[PDB]
Amino acid sequence: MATVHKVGDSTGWTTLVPYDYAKWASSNKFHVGDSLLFNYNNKFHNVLQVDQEQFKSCNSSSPAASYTSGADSIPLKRPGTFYFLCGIPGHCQLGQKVEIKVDPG
Amino acid sequence: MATVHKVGDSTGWTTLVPYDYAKWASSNKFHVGDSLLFNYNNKFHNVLQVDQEQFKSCNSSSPAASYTSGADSIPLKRPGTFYFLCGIPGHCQLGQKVEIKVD
Amino acid sequence: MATVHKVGDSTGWTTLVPYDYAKWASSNKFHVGDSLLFNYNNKFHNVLQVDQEQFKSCNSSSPAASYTSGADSIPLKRPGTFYFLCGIPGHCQLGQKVEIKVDPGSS
Amino acid sequence: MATVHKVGDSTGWTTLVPYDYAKWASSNKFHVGDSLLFNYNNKFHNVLQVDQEQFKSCNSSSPAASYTSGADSIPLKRPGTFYFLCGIPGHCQLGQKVEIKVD
Ligand SMILES: [Cu+]
Ligand SMILES: [Cu+]
Numbered sequence: 001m002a003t004v005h006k007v008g009d010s011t012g013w014t015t016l017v018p019y020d021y022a023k024w025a026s027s028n029k030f031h032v033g034d035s036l037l038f039n040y041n042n043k044f045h046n047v048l049q050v051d052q053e054q055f056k057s058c059n060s061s062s063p064a065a066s067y068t069s070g071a072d073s074i075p076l077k078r079p080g081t082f083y084f085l086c087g088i089p090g091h092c093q094l095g096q097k098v099e100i101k102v103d104p105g
Numbered sequence: 106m107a108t109v110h111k112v113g114d115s116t117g118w119t120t121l122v123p124y125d126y127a128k129w130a131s132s133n134k135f136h137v138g139d140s141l142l143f144n145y146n147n148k149f150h151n152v153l154q155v156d157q158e159q160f161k162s163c164n165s166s167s168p169a170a171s172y173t174s175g176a177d178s179i180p181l182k183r184p185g186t187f188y189f190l191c192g193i194p195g196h197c198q199l200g201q202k203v204e205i206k207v208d
Numbered sequence: 209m210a211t212v213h214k215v216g217d218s219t220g221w222t223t224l225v226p227y228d229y230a231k232w233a234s235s236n237k238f239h240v241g242d243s244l245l246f247n248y249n250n251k252f253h254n255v256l257q258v259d260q261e262q263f264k265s266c267n268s269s270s271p272a273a274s275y276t277s278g279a280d281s282i283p284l285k286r287p288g289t290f291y292f293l294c295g296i297p298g299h300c301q302l303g304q305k306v307e308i309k310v311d312p313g314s315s
Numbered sequence: 316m317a318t319v320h321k322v323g324d325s326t327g328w329t330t331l332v333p334y335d336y337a338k339w340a341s342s343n344k345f346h347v348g349d350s351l352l353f354n355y356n357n358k359f360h361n362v363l364q365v366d367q368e369q370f371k372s373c374n375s376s377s378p379a380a381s382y383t384s385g386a387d388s389i390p391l392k393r394p395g396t397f398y399f400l401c402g403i404p405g406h407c408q409l410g411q412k413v414e415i416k417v418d
């Protein structure tokens with residue numbers, strides 16, 4: 001049985017207050033088959049999949065994938081590092097971004 | 106021996122033709138541990154889990170979960186009745202919705 | 209052989225003047241594997257795939273598929289009748305809609 | 316006499332990882348009568364045929380043709396050099412473009 005990981009737990013995907021999404025990620029163990037659930041007010045944020053370089057620079061100008069439901073379920077079908085961030089101007093820079101490590105050795 | 110239930114069989118999840126999803130669900134036996142597989146053109150459809158009220162009114166404004174892979178594998182780990190519909194404008198009203206009773 | 213059918217030929221997809229897209233379709237023979245090419249100014253029109261009911265009523269509120277490139281290539285992979293129309297308010301009603309018959313049994 | 320060239324092989328048409336499409340094209344021999352197959356998640360990418368100038372500048376403003384099926388089968392019926400790129404903002408600049416020399 002796979003696992004659905006709620007990003008930020010009860011806090012969800014937000015910029016309201018500082019939230020260490022890196023620590024949230026490290027408190028979780030991601031396996032192939034699992035999924036991510038991003039809960040947020042879709043009138044304020046979105047979820048964009050980017051690469052390492054874009055993630056580090058909070059570059060949201062050319063995302064690989066985009067989600068805007070406010071309750072996005074995202075599949076983790078292959079091992080590796082995935083990166084997600086909110087593309088609204090200034091949000092990623094305030095910490096709204098998360099690195100997901102799926103089945104590392 | 107879990108079972109994967111392919112929603113709409115080969116027809117999949119669409120509005121191209123009328124398709125009786127209720128009848129499809131009835132031709133299936135859902136048990137805890139099983140899963141649902143929604144195959145569709147993800148550029149034009151989506152899969153949203155909603156509550157009974159939203160399902161009836163075809164309300165896709167506050168989904169419990171939104172799937173957009175085009176090949177969504179959704180687990181059935183709890184007994185009860187669950188509802189899914191496509192949130193694309195008017196699709197649910199065209200019949201793209203399905204009630205799933207587990208156990 | 210797979211053929212790309214240019215909707216409206218040199219006239220393209222437009223509402224500028226009346227254009228009988230039904231006669232354009234009739235002048236063509238659609239076979240599985242073929243495709244349609246819709247040429248238009250994407251700042252003015254779009255291409256929406258709908259069902260028979262919507263086609264007849266020019267209802268563009270719930271299309272099955274949508275295209276907005278101005279040079280849309282659309283695949284015809286299975287036999288049957290497909291319907292397309294421009295969803296911009298009033299355009300379909302002025303004639304911007306086309307019925308595509310793919311590999312029908314009879315003429 | 317007739318070959319289907321799967322763009323990017325199993326990797327397909329994407330920006331998820333750097334992928335050398337130029338090298339892929341070079342590992343292939345295109346002859347009139349062949350075809351190109353672009354496999355991708357059609358919710359996030361597209362395939363546009365453009366001219367040399369637009370290809371170089373990654374200009375997707377006026378494509379000769381736009382494919383969005385996620386499994387586009389594009390015929391190569393004429394010898395010469397043709398250009399394709401994904402028009403999604405910034406994808407072409409990330410390397411999602413391919414030059415095809417036929418015959
Ligand atoms: Cu945000
Ligand atoms: Cu839909």
Ligand SMILES: [Cu+]
Nearest residue numbers: 253294296299
């Ligand atoms: Cu129009």
Ligand SMILES: [Cu+]
Nearest residue numbers: 360401403406
């Ligand atoms: Cu792309």
